[model samples]
Target chain A: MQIFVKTLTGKTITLEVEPSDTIENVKAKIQDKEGIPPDQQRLIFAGRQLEDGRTLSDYNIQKESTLHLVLRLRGG
Target chain B: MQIFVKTLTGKTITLEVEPSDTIENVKAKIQDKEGIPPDQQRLIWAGKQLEDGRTLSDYNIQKESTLHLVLRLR
Candidate 1:
């Protein structure tokens, strides 16, 4: 399924994925699309923060689900 | 979405899945439910054999899609 990630910058990035994908997998895809490293990404769906080890199915995420992406502070 | 798998045994197995699942992934889940190994399971959807490397979305398969599962000859 294709899911969307809405960044704080108002850009919504679309990606192809499956329920088998872990949140980390998604971060990796997001990084490829927007140049933001996975470690610097904080993803939230349905008002809950996503974990790297958890699969999309674990969080009931499906096609067309829009996840909120928050960038972590970096380069201090 | 939940898809149905119709086996030759006349049993329809309900599986929880999404379009993101590859044929291989679905077969893995089938193994858990029916004790059938992935290599021995063949799944068909809409008159086409499902590929292990391709996702369900690639075939436009949606919720309630019933796939045929044929056990390979051992």
Candidate 2:
């Protein structure tokens, strides 16, 4: 299924993600194009923060679902 | 929009591609996941071989369109 990631700047990144893939995998995949650190991304979907270890299916991520990405400051 | 790349082995790779992206861009993006040379791919859409320099929109590629991928023997 494809999900749209909305960034802080309001730009949307469309990703083709598998139901079995974890949030961490998705974040790193996004890093491939966005040149980001996975740790710095906070994926919010369906009113909850997506945990890295859980599958997208665990969150009921569906086709064309919009996931919000919040940039978190590095904690050093 | 999302377009599906149907491989010779019946596997489908869904990709979110912009209409302005050229076929070459799409091929390289596919290579990122499939781990193959772009030259080894031949994408067929709407009964025509998709050219590298042409944008997807040039070929009228639409949402949920299925593009056939033929892997050439390298």
Candidate 3:
């Protein structure tokens, strides 16, 4: 299913996800698609870390559902 | 000196910073200045956690220098 993610710039991108995909897995795929490094990336949904090992089902996120992923960088 | 912060929307807001303000302190001020919570805020410079208690001087961040502070909700 396709999921929508909003960047820090408020730009949105849509991607396909498998039912069994974990949050981390989605992040990895986004990194590849967006050319952002995993370490430099952070995905937040409803104000919490999209904990590793947690699947979309665990969070009640559905297929083709939209989520917010904030790109986090440390320091100025 | 004044520093510019770009929000998630890429809109830039400028704030004045004292020379002695720590990163955490700046975050708090931004929260007040921008209505965002401090705990939910994250300031990233060059892709790393800006260590707590470190001052602008310690980080070599100059007066009027712009630093990116991402609103980290985690």
Candidate 4:
């Protein structure tokens, strides 16, 4: 399935992850795309903490869903 | 003047600034509204760093303009 990850600067980067992928896994992929450091990756969904190791199913994230990942620092 | 800043989570926080205020000034206000820390306030505009002391006029930003200020750690 595909999900659109929007950067802090309004850039939309899409990623295709398997349904079995967890939110943590998706976050890794997002960090890779955005070049954000792992420690700085605090993924907030719907204004709540995204617990590590939780799958999309756990959070009810469906296919083609859009998530935003704003990096704390970039181009450093 | 007012500018609408949308958070990374799609939350819009409006700020009213004087015409003499700079982007740096707006950033300060945004930090207050979103409760985001200073070091983490990565305020980007059009995919670039918002230079300190640069006023809205320098960036050609207008009143009632909608700017996206995605709090990095929000």
lDDT of 1 by residue, A1-76 (tens): 9998875456787899999999999999998988888877767665355678989999899899898776654221
Give per-residue CA lDDT, model 4, range B1-67, as digits (tens).
8788765566777898876787778878877877776555545555444555677776677888777
Estimate, for each residue in A1-76, the C-alpha lDDT of model 2 and write its tens digit: 7889985355788998999999999999889979878877767664355679988888889889887676644221
lDDT of 3 by residue, A1-76 (tens): 8888875455789988886888889888988899877776666555455666778777778766777665545443
iRMS per model, in Å, is 21.5, 20.7, 5.8, 5.7
Candidate no. 3 TM-score = 0.56
**Winner by TM-score between candidate 2 and candidate 1:** 1
| Candidate 2 residue pairs in clash (backbone atoms < 3 Å) | none
True-structure lDDT of candidate 2 = 0.77
Best by TM-score: 3
Query: Which stretches of candidate 4 lie above 4 Å from their native place?
Result: A6-14, A18-62, A68-76, B8-10, B47-53
Off by over 4 Å in 2: B1-74
Order by lDDT, highest first: 1, 2, 3, 4
Span of 10 residues, lowest total lDDT, candidate 3 chain A: A67-76
Q: What is the lDDT of candidate 4?
A: 0.66
Worst 10 residues of 1 chain A by lDDT: A67-76
- Against the unseen true structure, what C-alpha lDDT does each candidate score? 0.77, 0.77, 0.70, 0.66
Candidate order (TM-score): 3, 4, 1, 2
TM-score of chain B of 2: 0.91
Q: DockQ scores for all the models shown?
A: 0.01, 0.01, 0.16, 0.15
Q: Candidates 3 and 4: which is better by lDDT? A: 3
Clashes of each: 1, 0, 7, 0
Residue A66's lDDT within candidate 2 is 88
